Nucleic acid binder design. Structure first.
Lengths: 135, 138
RNA sequence: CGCACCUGACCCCAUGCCGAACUCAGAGUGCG
RNA sequence: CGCACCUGACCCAUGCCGAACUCAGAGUGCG
């Protein structure tokens, strides 16, 4: 919720000033965060459900658990990742963009942050201004 | 399909030159065309689109219209017929250039109503895409 | 070997229209 | 009143996700 507010109040106007977008709907915005937890199953699923607030799908060849977060579950999870999880580790790789505006992070737990930016450069600016700790 | 070829060979490079897009996937591109007794209207609409129309029913269940959402090659084939055959044979002043919805999509009615949905984010870019594809604006 | 992106529809499966979605398939981008 | 866009979440929905399907709501476009 706080992270979402930051998007509207702080990030979106700064993106407009930096890239010259003429309308608000053109500005890059997070679309979804996809979490895949590679691989008892019962326990892994309940933990992933607890941390995302969403029921995981079982991916079968059972080799994985997947959630697609959008809207407020997306923002709430991100806020947890940036404020709680990451700072308990011993910053993000700025080259890990897929060439089409999406960021990939592996922790194995793979996370895809999918944005509506069409370029890595704009996606980078969006995620940096949201407080993703790069470099 | 000739209209599709025209998009890739002629329209997309001209949009790149005019608006300065740095990558091909950023260039505006058609996403879909939505076309909105019953037996007869459905058979004709199916024949001209190559697709099965959905029946819109009152939210009573009496039929109040027919809709088809065309994507991909059925979209291009239908458009080519619309631009080359149907529109110029209207007993015709050209399409209204003010009928963009403010978000890059165009609407016209002939009643047969047609929604042309593009990935352009502004009316100005959508206008350029549809003009270069051969939409005949007045 | 997996997920995301990307591109498709012979194939299991699918649209109360649409391979959009769901399903399946395929050799490059990112990550593990 | 409908379709497209847009914004959401009592019928309904996701083999996860209001993405989709469903439903709802002033605005924009078009009937």
């Amino acid at each position: 919720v706080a992270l979402k507010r930051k998007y509207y109040e702080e990030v979106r106007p700064e993106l407009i000033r930096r890239f010259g977008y003429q309308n608000v709907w053109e500005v890059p915005r997070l679309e979804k965060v996809v979490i895949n937890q590679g691989l008892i199953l019962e326990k892994a699923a309940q933990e992933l459900a607890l941390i995302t607030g969403q029921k995981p799908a079982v991916t079968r060849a059972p080799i994985g658990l997947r959630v697609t977060l959008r809207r407020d579950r997306m923002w709430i999870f991100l806020e947890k990742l940036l404020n709680v999880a990451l700072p308990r580790i011993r910053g993000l790789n700025p080259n890990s963009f897929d060439g089409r505006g999406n960021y990939n992070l592996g922790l194995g737990m793979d996370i895809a942050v999918v944005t509506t930016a069409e370029t890595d450069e704009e996606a980078r600016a969006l995620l940096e201004l949201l407080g993703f700790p790069f470099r």
